[PDB]
Amino acid sequence: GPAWPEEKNYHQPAILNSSALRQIAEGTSISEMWQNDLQPLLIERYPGSPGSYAARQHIMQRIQRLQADWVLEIDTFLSQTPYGYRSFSNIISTLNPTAKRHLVLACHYDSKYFSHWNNRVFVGATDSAVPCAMMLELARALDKKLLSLKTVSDSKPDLSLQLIFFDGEEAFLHWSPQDSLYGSRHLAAKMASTPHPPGARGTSQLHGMDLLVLLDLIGAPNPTFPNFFPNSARWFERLQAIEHELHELGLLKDHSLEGRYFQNYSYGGVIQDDHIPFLRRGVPVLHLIPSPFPEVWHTMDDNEENLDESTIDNLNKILQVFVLEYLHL
């Protein structure tokens, strides 16, 4: 300090060797995630609905049962909407809240509002129940390692982990600047105006965000994630390297390098998503959204039946390795 917000610029991974990679691949369970983390979220959960409450309680209860020292905060606020003033609640789960720096994984836990059509209900399986369940499975699978971050008299982390589950990512109607990103626009502004660490004179919680890794629209077959931003390109390249090495070790399922997920191509345009209010305030973003979107995007067919189990399993392994390497665990 006050150079500590520049540490993210020089931060390097602590790369896992083959033995450790095999351990991570064996330590995550796609069937356990499916039953215990994902299926309870495959419900109608637009903001303010009973399902939104049920989804929030589920996310909190799955984090609270873990051994690591997660601190849960519910960030509840009002916003104008096309249907008038409404309440929204982001979920923030933080290890070591006073650590200056956090790696941040995020997704949205609301589902887009639709009236029931032909007795069908929109549950947003890729969008984003699967991202939610991936974050919960990561917390569970890495629980023993994340517990070592716990602050004692001997070690106090400089860098730790935070999960954000945004409410209200979706428009109530179709997208507009005022009807979308309710939770992320609120939370980015809040973090930008909150000193961090406690007592700081001139640094905010946003300065402490090392990297925002935003998962969206994951779970369909054959996703291709572009390398959107130059100031996170080196971390995109790490995802590529992790995918390549897990592949070569035989630790991925139904996977080829020709059909790899992290491909060598950029994307010039802007995708509206929860990263935008953070990106426009200078937070580095790794946006794990596929291009093109799943074929089922914003249809009633974005459901459990159309999820690709082995692709989600593969991405769990890649993401968990990424997080351990980032945190030097």
Ligand SMILES: [Zn+2]
């Ligand atoms: Zn959507």
